Design a protein around this nucleic acid. Structure first.
Lengths: 125, 231, 103, 63, 48, 209, 23
RNA sequence: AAUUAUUGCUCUUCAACGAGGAAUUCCUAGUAAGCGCAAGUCAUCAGCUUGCGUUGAUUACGUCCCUGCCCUUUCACAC
């Protein structure tokens, strides 16, 4: 049994599930590499959990993301949320708490919606 | 010394619309134009000082305020002036009831007031008048205010009797190289010049003696032509 | 006309200059400066344009009596422009000066 | 002419101003003690800077 | 600049309509529509 | 001679990541090309309202900026330019199209001017923000000052409206006309629609003070 | 009409003008 | 066989149109606006009705100046 972690990301009807296990660096979304995530114009939204912390944080793990629902924009936001939360959870479960806190600080400083779900519920006046 | 242009063939200058925001030009706005159509019994007619005194008295509006002939003769003067033929003149009509009319410089206003009245009736009810040769809209009714349709860099004056007398050629020379001129002329019998106080930069006067609206338009057009060397 | 396109995209026209009424036989880019375009036409006037504001020529070089159909930029000196014309004279212009007459 | 920059120290209330117009008190950034009362068209809060073309006119109620 | 003569109708009436047999047939269709709508409304009122 | 080593082994991921994406971790750049540092707001009184301090990779941030009165000042200014490009009806909601237009506009600006296009956008907004305005008094007009937020809003609206007007009924597209508008507005060249409108409003205010 | 405070400024203008003139 | 224009092309011939005037109405966040998809639920609806998701903003969030409506003027400390 390898060390593995399951996390979820949401944006509207989209839902992404990330499995982060011990590995070599394979980052796949829907059975396809992360560098083919469409659209081109929004690929860096998917990339930015990787680029905020560094690829060295991803050097020893495998991320596998399965996404259903929603549209292109919703699915991109669900992917990036699931990947960020899976990084934080893996570094808290099998790596140090200091690494977890530093990752959470970086992600929170850039964008909290990487970590906490953005729910646009109605507000009656 | 200097090379000639490749073609010395004379060419028709471009006609100026409100789509062209950039080109320097002269613009005349005939404000407070008395252009109102009313239904008799059944005939729609443009209201007249001479032919509709009974209708004007019944509706309560004064008969001296119903003067579309001033607008007619000012249109004749402006469109027959050489600056229009050179293509550097644009005409807007601002009626007293709030209707704004754009006049294409290529239109030919009929010389007789009867035909002018019929044309104004059809224009005011159909919102546009096209041409016989091509279907281009020669007269159009457009959305207020005028400053939406005016050029972007434009200097706005009102022709008024009380304002100090200027020289038109010197004023047009003092204008900038890229800036256009807009002149508000009251196309009315007897009023006072509040018609364009929301738009204009300033009020200027043309002569010490009182002028008709057609004479004011003709004087400012002649000064513009001598300033821009049109002739 | 002087039409400046993207080098590998014929659909997009970044700039279109009405340089002359006569044919423009030379269009060259300044080698030292990437902002300057030199055009030589049958007006017998060569014109240096800035790529940013191309409504008026940045500089007009005159003094040629016939048909400038070649120009060049001296490599070390970015102020020098050489124009060759059909009257036989290669005229060197210093752009920092007036530029109406060759040095 | 040079323009003056003045920071909003207080948005004045119960002025009686015309709707859309807000009366404020601003302290000059150049001389940090001088103050002047002005009228502002946009949404203004405290501690933002206004660029005044003239620094001498005292604002009145527009009504 | 060119000059174009305006296309306008003397004695213009906005209420009155502006080949001719087809126009008469179209007016007849308009009359048919009005009559059919009116009879439908009358029949429905009687039924209620 | 002081050195800190934090990488003790060169990183190779099993999935291949492109090299420009690999240099993208050292600095966050707009569309991976334009740098938010050495970007300065030239006009103070607009530093708080034209914000470039927080780098982004693309101009599609789905944050809430309408909940609070001055929350929109915290929004990135390229995002606000994109949001104003979604205006004028026919392309309501087509934000990816507007982001593509901004991307091509910044490419055109950098090619023509050899500058950082974010700085050109900042200079355009700070120049085209009018400093004095009028308001009607119940027809008298009285000159008033204008808040920095309204200055930024009106600058963005004037730039986008001028770009649309230049692109309409013409061969040139919205990206080319917006690039021309931003270049002339940053230059203050008075060719631009937004600078002409700003000078017109300020002149009317100077008259009616 | 006038707001409170504007009446105070106009009263201050009138009164202080009279006092300064008398002094 | 062009009378049947066999037909072809062009001109002439006849109507409308190129984003909608004055007035007037609605509207503040997953809102305006766009896009399709499904259902047809005892009233209502198919000359349509309702639902569902997908993209998704600009501007104000102040003020009683105007136009309305409403309300008052009859526990300590401090006022």
């Amino acid at each position: 049994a390898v060390p593995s972690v399951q996390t979820f990301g949401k944006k509207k009807s989209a839902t992404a599930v990330a499995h982060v296990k011990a590995g070599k660096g394979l980052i796949k979304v829907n059975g396809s590499p992360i560098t083919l995530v469409e659209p081109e114009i929004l690929r860096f939204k998917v990339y930015e959990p990787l680029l905020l912390v560094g690829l060295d944080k991803f050097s020893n793990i495998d991320i596998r993301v399965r996404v259903t629902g929603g549209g292109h924009v919703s699915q991109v936001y669900a992917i990036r949320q699931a990947i960020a939360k899976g990084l934080v959870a893996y570094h808290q479960k099998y790596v140090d708490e200091q690494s977890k806190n530093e990752l959470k600080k970086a992600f929170t400083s850039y964008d909290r919606t990487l970590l906490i779900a953005d729910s646009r519920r109605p507000e009656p006046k | 010394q200097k090379a000639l242009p490749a073609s010395l063939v004379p060419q028709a200058p471009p006609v100026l619309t409100s789509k062209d925001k950039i080109t320097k030009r002269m613009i005349v706005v005939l404000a407070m134009a008395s252009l109102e159509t009313h239904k008799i019994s059944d005939k729609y007619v443009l209201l007249n000082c001479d032919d509709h005194q009974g209708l004007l008295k019944k509706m309560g509006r004064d008969i001296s305020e119903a003067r579309p002939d001033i607008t007619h003769q000012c249109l004749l003067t402006l469109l027959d002036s050489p600056i229009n033929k050179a293509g550097k003149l644009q005409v807007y009509i601002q009626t007293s009831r709030g209707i704004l009319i754009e006049v294409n410089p290529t239109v030919r206003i009929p010389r007789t007031f009867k035909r002018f009245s019929g044309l104004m009736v059809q224009l005011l009810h159909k919102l546009s008048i096209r041409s016989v040769n091509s279907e281009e809209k020669l007269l159009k009714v457009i959305k207020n205010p005028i400053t939406d349709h005016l050029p972007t860099k434009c200097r706005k004056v009102t022709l008024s009797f009380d304002a100090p007398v200027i020289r038109v050629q010197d004023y047009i020379e003092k204008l900038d190289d890229d800036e256009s001129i807009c002149v508000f002329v009251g196309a009315m019998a007897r009023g006072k010049d509040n018609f364009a106080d929301e738009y204009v930069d300033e009020k200027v006067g043309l002569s010490n003696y009182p002028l008709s609206a057609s004479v004011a338009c003709s004087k400012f057009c002649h000064g513009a032509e001598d300033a821009w060397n049109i002739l | 006309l002087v039409s400046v396109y993207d080098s590998y995209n014929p659909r997009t026209i970044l700039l279109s200059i009405n340089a002359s009424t006569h044919p423009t036989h030379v269009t060259k880019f300044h080698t030292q400066d990437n902002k300057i375009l030199a055009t030589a036409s049958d007006d017998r006037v060569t014109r240096l344009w800035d790529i940013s504001n191309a409504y008026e020529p940045q500089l007009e070089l005159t003094g040629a009596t016939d048909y400038v159909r070649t120009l060049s930029f001296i490599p070390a000196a970015p102020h020098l422009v050489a124009t060759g014309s059909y009257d036989g004279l290669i005229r060197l212009y210093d752009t920092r000066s007036s530029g109406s007459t060759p040095i | 002419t040079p323009v003056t920059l003045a920071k909003v120290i207080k948005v004045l209330g119960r002025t009686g101003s015309r709707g859309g117009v807000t009366q404020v008190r601003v302290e000059f950034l150049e001389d940090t003690s001088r103050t002047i009362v002005r009228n502002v068209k946009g949404p203004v809060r405290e501690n933002d800077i206004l660029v005044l073309m003239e620094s001498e006119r005292e604002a009145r109620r527009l009504r | 600049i060119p000059t174009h003569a305006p296309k306008y109708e003397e004695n213009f009436n906005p209420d009155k309509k502006s080949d001719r047999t087809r126009s008469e047939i179209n007016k007849m269709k308009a009359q048919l529509k009005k009559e059919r709508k009116f009879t439908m409304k009358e029949i429905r009122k009687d039924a209620k | 001679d002081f050195e800190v080593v934090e990488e003790f082994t060169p990183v190779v991921l099993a999935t291949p990541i492109p090299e420009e994406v690999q240099q993208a971790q050292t600095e966050i750049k707009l569309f991976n090309k334009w740098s938010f540092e050495e970007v300065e707001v030239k006009d103070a009184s607009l530093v708080d309202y034209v914000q470039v301090r927080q780098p982004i990779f693309v101009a599609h941030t789905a944050g809430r900026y309408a909940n609070k009165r001055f929350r929109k000042a915290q929004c990135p200014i390229i995002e606000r330019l994109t949001n104003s490009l979604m205006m004028n009806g026919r392309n309501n909601g087509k934000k990816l199209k507007a982001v593509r237009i901004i991307k091509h506009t910044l490419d055109i600006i950098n090619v023509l001017t050899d500058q950082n296009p974010i700085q050109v956008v900042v200079d355009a907004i700070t120049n085209t923000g009018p400093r004095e305005d009028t308001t009607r008094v119940g027809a008298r007009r009285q000159a008033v000052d204008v808040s920095p937020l309204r200055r930024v809003n009106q600058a963005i609206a004037l730039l986008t409206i001028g770009a649309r007007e230049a692109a309409f009924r013409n061969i040139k597209t919205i990206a080319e006309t917006l690039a021309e508008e931003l270049i002339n507005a940053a230059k203050g060249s008075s060719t631009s629609y937004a600078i002409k409108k700003k000078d017109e409003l300020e002149r009317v205010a100077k008259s009616n003070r | 009409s006038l707001k409170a405070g504007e009446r105070l400024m106009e009263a201050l203008d009138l009164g202080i003008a009279e006092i300064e003139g008398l002094e």
